[PDB]
Amino acid sequence: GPSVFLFPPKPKDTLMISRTPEVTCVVVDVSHEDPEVKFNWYVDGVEVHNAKTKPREEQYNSTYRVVSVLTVLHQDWLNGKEYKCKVSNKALPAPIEKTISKAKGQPREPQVYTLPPSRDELTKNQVSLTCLVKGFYPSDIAVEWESNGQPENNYKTTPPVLDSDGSFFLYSKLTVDKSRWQQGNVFSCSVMHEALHAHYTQKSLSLS
């Protein structure tokens, strides 16, 4: 019947002390027949009571969806604590358990390189600015572009890819009008990751 999906905090939230990371427990296919759901949360086995469950709400299919959110401490998530969400419902003979933690494995520092557009690309009115981020472990990561403190609209980032040494890599393509590039504007790829010092680094790229 009702299924449960447990989601981790956003990388950004866990890596910036100013932000609040939370684990999210989503119960779907809750039926009108038995629409009561109780959540029990556990951090490394020990129960906790600061979860806020949202009021259940109807779906376009006539099931109910119901979500419980548990704020987590940056250090706890980064230190590898296990978060367990226990879901009990009258239609469930025995509760459903999902437990989640950060990716296991030795953390590896990302190397961040910026690559300008190929010469060939200057025959267009738009050009490709490239951020190559490689050698990192946990795949969990945030990569963003900006120019003079302002975030850039047109960019897309590949999913992380398992490289041969077992680290991950990825690329982010930033698209700007050629004039912006030829004007000598400075663009910046920002990267946030746990094995980075102060969880953050940025590399610049402009026309020299």
Ligand X SMILES: *[C@@H]1O[C@H](CO[C@@H]2O[C@@H](C)[C@@H](O)[C@@H](O)[C@@H]2O)[C@@H](O[C@@H]2O[C@H](CO)[C@@H](O[C@@H]3O[C@H](CO[C@H]4O[C@H](CO)[C@@H](O)[C@H](O)[C@@H]4O[C@@H]4O[C@H](CO)[C@@H](O)[C@H](O)[C@H]4NC(C)=O)[C@@H](O)[C@H](O[C@H]4O[C@H](CO)[C@@H](O)[C@H](O)[C@@H]4O[C@@H]4O[C@H](CO)[C@@H](O)[C@H](O)[C@H]4NC(C)=O)[C@@H]3O)[C@H](O)[C@H]2NC(C)=O)[C@H](O)[C@H]1NC(C)=O
* Positions that interact with a second copy (CB under 8 A): 111, 113-118, 120-121, 128, 130, 132, 134, 154, 156-159, 161-164, 169-171, 173, 175, 203
Q: If DSSP codes are grouped into helix, strand and coil, which group holds residue 197?
A: helix
For residue 189, what are the contacts with CB-CB under 8 A and spacing of at least 6? 112, 114, 131, 133, 143, 144, 145, 172, 174, 202, 203, 205
Instruction: Choose one: 3-11, 85-93, 104-112, 155-163; the region binding ligand X (CB under 6 A).
Output: 3-11
CB of 53 to ligand X, least distance (A): 13
For residue 71, what are the contacts with CB-CB under 8 A and spacing of at least 6? 20, 21, 22, 50
Q: How many residues bind ligand X (CB under 6 A)?
A: 12
103 lies in the binding site for ligand X (CB under 6 A):
no
128: its two tokens: 């490709």
Partner whose footprint covers residue 158, from a second copy, ligand X, none (CB < 5 to 8 Å by kind):
a second copy
How far, rounded to the nearest angstrom, does the alpha carbon of residue 55 sit from its chain's CA centroid? 25
CB of 111 to a second copy, least distance (A): 7
146 lies in the binding site for ligand X (CB under 6 A):
no
26 lies in the binding site for ligand X (CB under 6 A):
yes
33 lies in the binding site for ligand X (CB under 6 A):
no
CB of 128 to a second copy, least distance (A): 6
Binding residues for ligand X restricted to 45-74, rule: CB under 6 A: 59-61, 63, 65
For residue 153, what are the contacts with CB-CB under 8 A and spacing of at least 6? none
Partner whose footprint covers residue 117, from ligand X, a second copy, none (CB < 5 to 8 Å by kind):
a second copy
Would you call 171 exposed, middle or buried from its count of C-beta atoms within 10 A (0-12, 13-18, 19+)?
middle
